[PDB]
C-alpha cells in the first residue's frame, strides 16, 4: 500500500533549576561600614577602609 506522507506534532517541557551562593559579614564590621561605630578619630578611618 502506497504510504501516504505522514505528519506529526511533538512538544517538550521546560525544566527549572536554580543557583545560590552566600557570604556573611561580621558584627562589628557592620558597625564600621554604616558609621554607628565610627569615631571622628584618625584610626577608625583605617579600620573602615
Amino acid at each position: 500500500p502506497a504510504d501516504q506522507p505522514v505528519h506529526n506534532y511533538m512538544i517538550k517541557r521546560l525544566d527549572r533549576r536554580s543557583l545560590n551562593a552566600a557570604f556573611s559579614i561580621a558584627v562589628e564590621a557592620l558597625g564600621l561600614i554604616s558609621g554607628e561605630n565610627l569615631d571622628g578619630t584618625h584610626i577608625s578611618s583605617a579600620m573602615r577602609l
Binding site: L14, D15, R17, S18, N20, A22, S24, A26, V27, L30
Partner: protein, 49 residues
C-alpha cells in the same frame, strides 16, 4: 552540537537574615533549560581508564 540546549537565565535575587548582629546575604538566580534537538545531540566515548 552547534546548539544543543535552550537555556534561560533569570533575574538575580538577594535575601538576607540578621543572625547574630551581622547580615547573612544569600544570592539566588533562577534558571531553566530545555533540549531543542529532535533525536540525540550528544554522546560520550569513555576512552581512558
Amino acid at each position: 552540537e552547534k546548539a544543543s540546549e535552550s537555556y534561560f537565565m533569570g533575574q538575580m535575587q538577594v535575601a538576607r537574615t540578621e543572625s547574630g548582629g551581622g547580615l547573612h546575604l544569600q544570592l539566588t538566580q533562577p534558571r531553566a533549560n530545555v533540549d531543542l534537538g529532535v533525536g540525540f545531540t550528544a554522546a560520550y566515548a569513555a576512552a581512558a581508564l
